[PDB]
Every structure is written in structure tokens, then in C-alpha cells.
């Protein structure tokens, strides 16, 4: 895939991602907060089309993600991120994608997700999260 | 179970845990580093006894945990931590316990586990980890 790295910001205003019922997460883009300003992150797009767009708009700064979870598993047959769910102190957005394969979760008791980095080809290959107080 | 919280330290020198191959993790106890000196954490002991002791002794400071993983699953009607695996930069420790149920993993790209908290009844119910740069 094409490696992407947003780096680290002040928090998260919005997540734009797309997915396919049959395969996996495709596109990923974040609108971060940067010292009180929306920071529009670069849209990291799949190499292919066919996905269902989803928009996760947060009530920043009162609403914030408390748990990222999902599934990784094989697709044509690359290990990719098939599924994502974002749970905040207000609600649960997802699951989006196919909920099959190896489940993962990151719940946070103290701290904030402040960045994403990863790689996308046909599908979201992997990702990591910056965490901060 | 009985709740516990070690707090934060400088790093990890040793993990002493116990388990049984039919059930789950039983006891958990950590020798932290505190500013270049060992600090013996409290021993968090199951309500029951009979588990197989394990000592993980790390070559601190050059050796450190890069990933923690295992399984959560039901034992006698309780959700508990059924297995743990500790992966350092030098080798893997585990699995200990029983690898059945729902997998979880925390890989770390940048930063250090510097404390544990959780609860233990007959088995380790849950735990969380303090992370620091």
C-alpha cells in the first residue's frame, strides 16, 4: 500500500472512511483539531472504487473516542483491516466493514487519540494511533 | 474480584505471574524500575491457590516489552483473562494459560508500559496498562 502518517494533533473532529460489505475498509481521512482549528487531513484513498462512504462527525471537544476496535483478516489474500468501530463517550459508530477474522480493541482509560498512521492499497493494510494526554 | 492499581514507574524489570492450563491466569506481580532502582510491586493473588508460577526476568534497561497479548474467555460463568503473552524486543514469553476465547493485543510502536492495574478474583478479571515515553 501507500504508507500515510498524519502525525499528531490536538484531537479529532471528524472521521471519513468508506468500506465494502464483502471485503474491507477502503478509504480513510480525518479532520483533526489543531489548537482549536479544524485541520483537514489528507484523504488517504484506496487504489480501487466500490466502497460505501461513512462520515463520523464528533461533538468536539465534549465528545471523544474511548475505544477503537475491529477485525483484521485475509482479502485476496493480503492481511488487511476488514472492520472498524469507534466508540466515544457519547455513542458507538459502526461496525463498518466485515466483522470476520481476528478481533482487536484499544480501549483508553486516560488519554486521547491524536493521530493516525498506516498504509492503504486496495484496502486499509494496517494502522497505528498516536496517543497523548 | 479485588481491584488493584500499581501506579506508574520508570519501566519493568520482571513479571511474576501464575496460571493453570485448564482455567486462566491466577496471580500477577511486577518488579518495576524506579529511577534506576528495583521496586517490588504488591503481589496480586487469586482467592484460590494451586497455579503454576512463572518468572519473566528481563534484561533491563536494554530489554523491554513491545507487545502484550492473550485471550479473554468464560471460566465458571465469569469473563476472565485466560492467557497472556509478553513479547519483548529480544524474545517472547508465553503463552501462559489457555488460548481460547477472544484474542486481544497491544502492540507498542513508541513508548513503554510502566504500570498495571486490574482486578483478580479466582482469576485475573481484567487489567489495564500505564503507558509513557
Amino acid at each position: 500500500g501507500k504508507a500515510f502518517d498524519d502525525g499528531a494533533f490536538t484531537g479529532i473532529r471528524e472521521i471519513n472512511l468508506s468500506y465494502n460489505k464483502e471485503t474491507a475498509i477502503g478509504d480513510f481521512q480525518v479532520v483533526y483539531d489543531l489548537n482549536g482549528s479544524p485541520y483537514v487531513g489528507q484523504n488517504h484513498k484506496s487504489f480501487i472504487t466500490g466502497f460505501t462512504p461513512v462520515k463520523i462527525s464528533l461533538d468536539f471537544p465534549s465528545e471523544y473516542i474511548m475505544e477503537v476496535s475491529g477485525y483484521t483478516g485475509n482479502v485476496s489474500g493480503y492481511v488487511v483491516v476488514r472492520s472498524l468501530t469507534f466508540k466515544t463517550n457519547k455513542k458507538t459508530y459502526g461496525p463498518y466493514g466485515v466483522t470476520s477474522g481476528t478481533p482487536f480493541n484499544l480501549p483508553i482509560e486516560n488519554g486521547l487519540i491524536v493521530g493516525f498512521k498506516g498504509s492503504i492499497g486496495y484496502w486499509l493494510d494496517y494502522f497505528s494511533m498516536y496517543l497523548s494526554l | 474480584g479485588k481491584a488493584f492499581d500499581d501506579g506508574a514507574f520508570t519501566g519493568i524489570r520482571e513479571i511474576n505471574l501464575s496460571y493453570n492450563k485448564e482455567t486462566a491466569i491466577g496471580d500477577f506481580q511486577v518488579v518495576y524500575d524506579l529511577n534506576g532502582s528495583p521496586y517490588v510491586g504488591q503481589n496480586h493473588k487469586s482467592f484460590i491457590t494451586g497455579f503454576t508460577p512463572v518468572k519473566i526476568s528481563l534484561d533491563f534497561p536494554s530489554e523491554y516489552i513491545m507487545e502484550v497479548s492473550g485471550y479473554t474467555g468464560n471460566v465458571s460463568g465469569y469473563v476472565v483473562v485466560r492467557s497472556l503473552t509478553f513479547k519483548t524486543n529480544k524474545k517472547t514469553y508465553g503463552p501462559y494459560g489457555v488460548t481460547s476465547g477472544t484474542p486481544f493485543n497491544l502492540p507498542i510502536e513508541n513508548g513503554l508500559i510502566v504500570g498495571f492495574k486490574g482486578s483478580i478474583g479466582y482469576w485475573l478479571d481484567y487489567f489495564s496498562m500505564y503507558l509513557s515515553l
Partner: peptide, 16 residues
């Protein structure tokens, strides 16, 4: 020892 600030990063989940 450089001028780039650093943060805790957890991950990756997915491929290698």
C-alpha cells in the same frame, strides 16, 4: 536528541 517532538504510538493492527 532531535527537534521533532514525540508521542506514544500504539499499533500497528493489520499486516506486518
Amino acid at each position: 536528541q532531535s527537534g521533532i517532538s514525540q508521542t506514544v504510538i500504539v499499533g500497528p493492527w493489520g499486516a506486518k
